[PDB]
């Protein structure tokens, strides 16, 4: 089916991991000497720098595929204590956020170190052939 | 995660019906199924149905097919993730065969091939199903606790209002010849509750 | 007790229809657990 | 019950101790899950084991389940004082709902008041002979010169009690010497003479 | 733009039946101070 | 058993925020003007058929008295009552 | 260690290869009627023009992987002739850059053709199973 924009945001993460590419659609876009046309820009314009905050992370890190990825980052216990069946299907998106919030920061430095250490990594396999 | 909180025990004669209540706190009611099991003293532990609160989805056991029916109220809304609601149960044709203790439970996901399962369980309710009347208790202060004699509908037995709590030992009861049962328990007050009769009575030792 | 009329401050007057409405931002960034690694 | 469980199994602390849970085809085990509860008497039950296969939220890493093709076991390792109850399977899918076993009864091995005034005034007489703090969960109660006894209950600290009471009449209060409540062996004697 | 689907609901608090959408509805600028003029009528009971 | 960080990119997660609404009229708004209009002159013309999601399960929290799209309107109409009167004829040598 | 943003501009370009993840990071983002919001915003769009002018070199090159990459274009002697261990432990990236300004259109030139040519050749890799 397709439930629509923000359809699956009251329900548990893997029912929710079907709609990403939805979400993502409607994420970038669905006049004379006024106010209204600096009203619009500047909405207009936060729109793309909402958008590409997300991309560059989304870049930097090993995954511009844009959709889901894994990584090679261990899930450090610490950060939950919660199972696999007991997230997702038991929990939602929103409610994950608001447990994760306080270490999301700390993931994301986490992230850029792998992905920059894999590319490194990989440029020496590249060039002893 | 939450806490499951069931009505009194009730005594009621064979035939006639009775409604249990259980109401919640601490979860989104909806998002969860409510499974009742009762236990009878000689068939053993027995699950009976169970209800969707979202949907109203039931599946009784072909048993209590015929003669049981659930309900649900709805969902009060306290914070954007928890709720509190109420869910009950009315039993009709009354037989011997159903005394004893009638639990309610919550279930354990949402999505998956166990969703239903009890996980979390109330405090039980006690029903007796018997043509003998209530008789209210008998209290006695203990010459160095206090001593439930003769009642017969389950006792609660506090201290100080609830105060003293510390070093009480409260035993069983006895089934004597009479059908009555007798337990008992050890400023000084000892609060004896007896709901079916409706009647409190607290003691000085 | 007595209710008379009054206003004065008009936000009220857009209180009165934008009472069911509230603004969100999207943070479509989330991170979750499972065992899955992507190989090297 | 169409679930049959083992009757009674055992196991000495710091051991294992495994639970069986049979039945037929229709019920157990082939296209069924399997779920495990610890139910103490009088109190609520506990999830331990669901979905013939992980454990419940909380459950410390001390149990494990298995099933195979006919019957499913639970393994207990390390036993615990507090380990000594009732422990029940049920048999169940994704549509239909469960079916509870018998039940298995695990054992862990290796480890008087005088009728007051106001009853006098009814006028009855009746002493209260109260048992606590004894293991094992067994013992017997004479009387000698309405005779009732209980069994044996576990109590909130892992160990057991009962109470046994004698209603006596107020005649007999200033006609016998004197009373006697055996346990076995204690004995408590009162002389009714206030 | 969250858009509560309730029909009793006085501004405050959670609503159990909320909708999502881009534009909120005709919402005309009228300009009065007593009394509101061409507004949005209530849903069954009047509101508080 | 030892588990893997997994990003995730479209997820409905949402937060509180205020930003800078624009208008929207239908296009018969910007039809009836001869200059007539005191708002419509650059308004978005509405979408033709507007899309309403009911998000089942949700349970949000709104407070109607600390909303800002409220503060937001108002500003604007003031800004909006001042700025149709600027080029418009000035009666100072009136007063007399 | 984190040196932080343009840590190694005076260091070599072998030393320098392991920041590019770093500087990346604060390449993108870290009113009423005034002349700032202006001031501001201009400015604001310069930064994406100047980001998003690199991002579509990087695209219509082979590597959109936006970190490092190496490419089937030999290095034409004619543009250094210097040798790898004496740039990458002997030379600064603005010192390199200031040899190679010279040729920097060129090559780009070629990186465009080789990837359009590489992309048109694998497509027919694809047809053929
Ligand atoms: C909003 O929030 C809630 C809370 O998060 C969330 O609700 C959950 O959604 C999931 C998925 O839909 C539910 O989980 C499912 O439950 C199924 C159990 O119902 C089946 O069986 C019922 C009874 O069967 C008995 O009786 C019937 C006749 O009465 C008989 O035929 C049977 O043989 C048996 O005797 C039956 O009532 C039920 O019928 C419902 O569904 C059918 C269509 O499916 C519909 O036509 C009916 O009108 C009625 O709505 C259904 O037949 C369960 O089977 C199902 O299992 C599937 O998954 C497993 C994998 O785990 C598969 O292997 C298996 O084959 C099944 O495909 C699944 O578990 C859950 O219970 C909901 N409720 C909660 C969590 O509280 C919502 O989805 C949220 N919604 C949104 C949009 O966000
Ligand atoms: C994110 O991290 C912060 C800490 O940086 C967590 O905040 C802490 O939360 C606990 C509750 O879980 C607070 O304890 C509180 O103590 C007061 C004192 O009486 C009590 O009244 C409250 O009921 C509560 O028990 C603790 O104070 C608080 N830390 C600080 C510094 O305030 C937060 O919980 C984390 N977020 C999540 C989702 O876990
Ligand atoms: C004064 O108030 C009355 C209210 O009855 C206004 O007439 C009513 O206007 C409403 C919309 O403002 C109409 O409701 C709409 O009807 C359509 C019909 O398809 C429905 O699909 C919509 O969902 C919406 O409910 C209502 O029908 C209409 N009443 C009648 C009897 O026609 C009137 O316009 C107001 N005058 C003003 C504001 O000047
Ligand atoms: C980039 O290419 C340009 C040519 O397009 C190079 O410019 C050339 O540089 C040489 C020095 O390396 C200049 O020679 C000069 O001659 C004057 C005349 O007396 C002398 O005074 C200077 O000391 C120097 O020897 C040459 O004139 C100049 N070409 C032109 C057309 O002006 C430039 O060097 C290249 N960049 C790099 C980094 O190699
Ligand atoms: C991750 O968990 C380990 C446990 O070994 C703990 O020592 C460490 O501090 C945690 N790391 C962070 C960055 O929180
Ligand atoms: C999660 O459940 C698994 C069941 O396979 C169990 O082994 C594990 O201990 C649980 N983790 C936590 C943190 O409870
Ligand atoms: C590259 O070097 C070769 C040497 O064979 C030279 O002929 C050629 O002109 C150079 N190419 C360019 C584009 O400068």
């Known amino acids: 089916v397709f439930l629509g924009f923000l359809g699956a945001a009251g329900s548990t993460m893997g029912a929710a991991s079907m709609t990403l590419t939805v979400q993502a659609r409607n994420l970038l876009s669905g006049l004379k000497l006024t106010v209204w046309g600096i009203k619009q820009l500047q909405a207009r314009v936060l729109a793309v720098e909402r958008y590409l905050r997300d991309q560059q992370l989304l870049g930097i890190w090993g995954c511009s595929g844009k959709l889901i990825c894994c990584t090679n980052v261990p899930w450090n216990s610490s950060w939950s204590n919660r199972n696999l069946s007991e997230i997702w299907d038991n929990m939602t998106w929103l409610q994950w956020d608001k447990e994760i919030s306080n270490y999301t920061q700390i993931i994301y430095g986490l992230l850029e170190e792998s992905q920059n250490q894999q590319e490194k990594n990989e440029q020496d396999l590249l060039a002893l052939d | 995660q939450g806490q499951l909180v069931q009505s009194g025990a009730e005594l009621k004669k064979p035939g006639a019906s009775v409604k249990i209540s259980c109401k919640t706190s601490?979860?989104?009611?909806?998002?969860?199924?409510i499974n009742w099991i009762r236990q009878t003293a000689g068939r053993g532990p027995e699950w009976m149905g169970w209800?969707?609160?979202?949907?109203?989805?039931?599946?009784?056991?072909?048993?209590?097919?015929?003669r049981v029916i659930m309900t649900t109220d709805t969902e009060v809304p306290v914070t954007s993730f928890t709720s509190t609601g109420a869910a009950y149960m009315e039993i009709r044709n009354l037989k011997f065969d159903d005394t004893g203790t009638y639990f309610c439970?919550?279930?354990?996901?949402?999505?998956?091939?166990?969703?239903?399962?009890?996980?979390?369980w109330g405090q039980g309710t006690l029903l007796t199903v018997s043509s003998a009347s209530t008789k209210g208790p008998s209290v006695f202060p203990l010459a160095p606790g206090c001593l439930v004699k003769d009642y017969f509908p389950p006792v609660t037995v506090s201290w100080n209002s609830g105060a003293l709590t510390s070093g009480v030992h409260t035993f069983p009861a006895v089934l004597q010849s009479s059908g009555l049962y007798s337990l008992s328990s050890v400023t000084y007050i000892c609060n004896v509750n007896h709901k079916p009769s409706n009647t409190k009575v607290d003691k000085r030792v | 007790e007595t209710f008379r009329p009054g206003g004065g401050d008009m936000r009220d007057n857009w209180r009165s229809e934008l009472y069911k409405y509230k603004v969100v931002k999207i943070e479509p960034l989330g991170v979750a657990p499972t065992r899955c690694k992507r190989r090297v | 019950s169409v679930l049959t469980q083992s009757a009674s199994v055992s196991g000495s602390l710091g051991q294992s101790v495994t639970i069986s849970c049979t039945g037929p085809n229709s019920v157990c085990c082939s296209h069924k899950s399997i779920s495990w509860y610890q139910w103490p008497p009088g109190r609520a039950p506990t999830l331990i084991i669901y979905e013939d296969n992980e454990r419940a939220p909380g459950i410390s890493p001390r149990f494990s389940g298995y099933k195979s093709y006919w019957s499913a076991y639970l393994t207990i390792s390390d036993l615990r004082p507090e380990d000594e109850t009732t422990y029940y399977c049920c048999s169940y899918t994704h549509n239909s709902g469960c079916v509870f076993g018998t039940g298995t009864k695990v054992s862990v091995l290796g480890q008087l008041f005088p009728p007051s005034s106001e009853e006098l005034q009814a006028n009855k007489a009746t002493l209260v002979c109260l048992i606590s703090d004894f293991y094992p969960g067994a013992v017997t109660v004479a009387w000698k010169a309405g005779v009732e006894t209980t069994t044996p209950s576990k109590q909130s600290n892992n160990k057991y009690a009962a109470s046994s009471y004698l209603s006596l009449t107020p005649e007999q209060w200033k006609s016998h010497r004197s009373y006697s409540c055996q346990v076995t062996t204690v004995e408590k004697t009162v002389a009714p003479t206030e | 733009i969250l858009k509560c689907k309730d029909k009793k609901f006085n501004g405050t608090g959670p609503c159990p039946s909320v909708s999502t959408v881009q534009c909120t509805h005709g919402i005309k600028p009228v300009v009065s101070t007593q009394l509101l003029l061409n507004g949005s009528l209530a849903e069954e009971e009047v509101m508080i | 058993e030892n588990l893997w960080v997994t990003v995730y990119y479209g997820v409905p997660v949402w937060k509180d925020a205020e930003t800078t609404l624009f208008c929207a009229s239908d296009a018969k708004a910007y039809e009836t003007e001869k200059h007539n209009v005191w708002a419509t002159h650059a308004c978005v013309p509405t979408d033709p058929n507007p899309q309403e999601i009911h998000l089942e399960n949700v349970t949000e929290e709104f407070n109607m008295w600390k909303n800002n799209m409220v503060e937001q309107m108002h500003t604007d109409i003031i800004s909006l009552w001042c700025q149709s009167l600027k080029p418009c004829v000035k009666l100072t040598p009136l007063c007399v | 260690v984190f040196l932080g943003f343009l840590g190694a501009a005076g260091s070599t370009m072998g030393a320098a290869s392991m920041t590019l993840t770093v500087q990346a990071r604060n390449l993108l983002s870290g009113l009423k009627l005034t002349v700032w919001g202006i001031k501001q915003l201009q400015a604001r769009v310069l930064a994406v023009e100047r980001y998003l002018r690199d991002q579509q070199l990087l695209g219509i090159w082979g590597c959109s992987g936006k970190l490092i990459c190496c490419t089937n274009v030999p290095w034409n002697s004619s543009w250094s002739n210097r040798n790898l261990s004496e740039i990458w432990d002997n030379m600064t990236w603005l010192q390199w850059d200031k040899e190679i300004s010279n040729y920097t259109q060129i090559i780009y030139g070629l990186l465009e053709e080789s990837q359009n040519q590489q992309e048109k050749n694998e497509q027919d890799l694809l047809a053929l199973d």
């Open positions: 209800i969707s609160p979202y949907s109203g989805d039931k599946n009784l056991a072909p048993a209590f097919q015929d």
């Open positions: 601490g979860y989104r009611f909806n998002f969860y199924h």
């Open positions: 439970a919550k279930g354990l996901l949402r999505d998956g091939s166990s969703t239903w399962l009890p996980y979390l």
